[PDB]
């Protein structure tokens, strides 16, 4: 996360770290959506241009974390993966269209002060909140700048950007399964996700019921926090039919 701040304790209790077994290293962010299911970006698991194609046994998820590097004894919980599900129409070839994946845990994780699931948006909450100017929050342990790494979880609040502005900022083909967020060059404030934040959540707090909803997944950007560029996020609601299908048939 670029130009963010240290998270407060328990600020993002749905935050999940995707952790490589060997070598032991951070792979990505992710989010807890129930006691057995974790949501992330497809490119965290499958990205052929970078020779990335992880299997279940390659990975762990670490839940309830704050420190990036410490083993947080008595606080974090570490889970093995039973199964990975990637969206069947995930487009890793071109533009990361439908950049979404689910991971089912081998065993349910116990909730605590530091571990708690985020909500997924219904159609109405999505319609109400996914509007240009409305801010969401992005969290992760990724790089602090494009060209370094945080001691603890970072957080940054960023405004959703008008779709034409998103489109005009890039040569990449944007789709309805993405939205973009970030400040404009003139606005003064700045901030962005960066490498390592991939797969983490873009959340919004509904003013209707005071619950946190995951509207987006950290997906892609040209560099990090570049003027005139924006961060692109998987549109969780647009792909919720797939999410529900997977959970309903495999859990």
């Amino acid at each position: 996360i670029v130009e963010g701040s240290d998270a407060e304790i328990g600020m993002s209790p749905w935050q999940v770290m995707l952790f490589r077994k060997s070598p032991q290293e951070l792979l990505c962010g992710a989010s807890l959506i129930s006691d057995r299911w974790v949501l992330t970006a497809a490119h965290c698991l499958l990205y052929p241009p970078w020779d990335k194609n992880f299997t279940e046994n390659d990975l762990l998820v670490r839940i309830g974390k704050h420190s990036r590097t410490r083993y947080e004894r008595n606080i974090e919980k570490i889970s093995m993966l039973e199964k990975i599900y990637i969206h069947p129409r995930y487009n890793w070839r071109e533009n990361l269209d439908r950049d979404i994946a689910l991971m089912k845990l081998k065993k349910p994780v116990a909730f605590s002060d530091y571990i708690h699931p985020v909500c997924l948006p219904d159609r109405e909450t999505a319609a109400s909140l996914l509007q240009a100017g409305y801010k969401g929050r992005v969290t992760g342990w990724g790089n602090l700048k494009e060209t370094g790494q945080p001691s603890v979880l970072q957080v940054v609040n960023l405004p959703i950007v008008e779709r034409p502005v998103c489109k005009d900022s890039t040569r990449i083909r944007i789709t309805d399964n993405m939205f973009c967020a970030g400040y404009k060059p003139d606005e003064g404030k700045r901030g962005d996700a960066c490498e390592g934040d991939s797969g983490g959540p873009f959340v919004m707090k509904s003013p209707f019921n005071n619950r946190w909803y995951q509207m987006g997944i950290v997906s892609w950007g040209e560099g990090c926090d570049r003027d005139g560029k924006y961060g692109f996020y998987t549109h969780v609601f647009r792909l919720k039919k797939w999410i529900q299908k997977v959970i309903d048939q495999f859990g």
Binding site: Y114, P117, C119
Partner: peptide
């Protein structure tokens, strides 16, 4: 599930985090 999105150390205790108001204020 039914309890999703309500943080034990914040919403469940009626405590606000330091920047959530920035979000609320943007929801015009």
């Amino acid at each position: 599930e039914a309890d999703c999105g309500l943080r034990p150390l914040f919403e469940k205790k009626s405590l606000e985090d330091k920047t959530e108001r920035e979000l609320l204020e943007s929801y015009i």
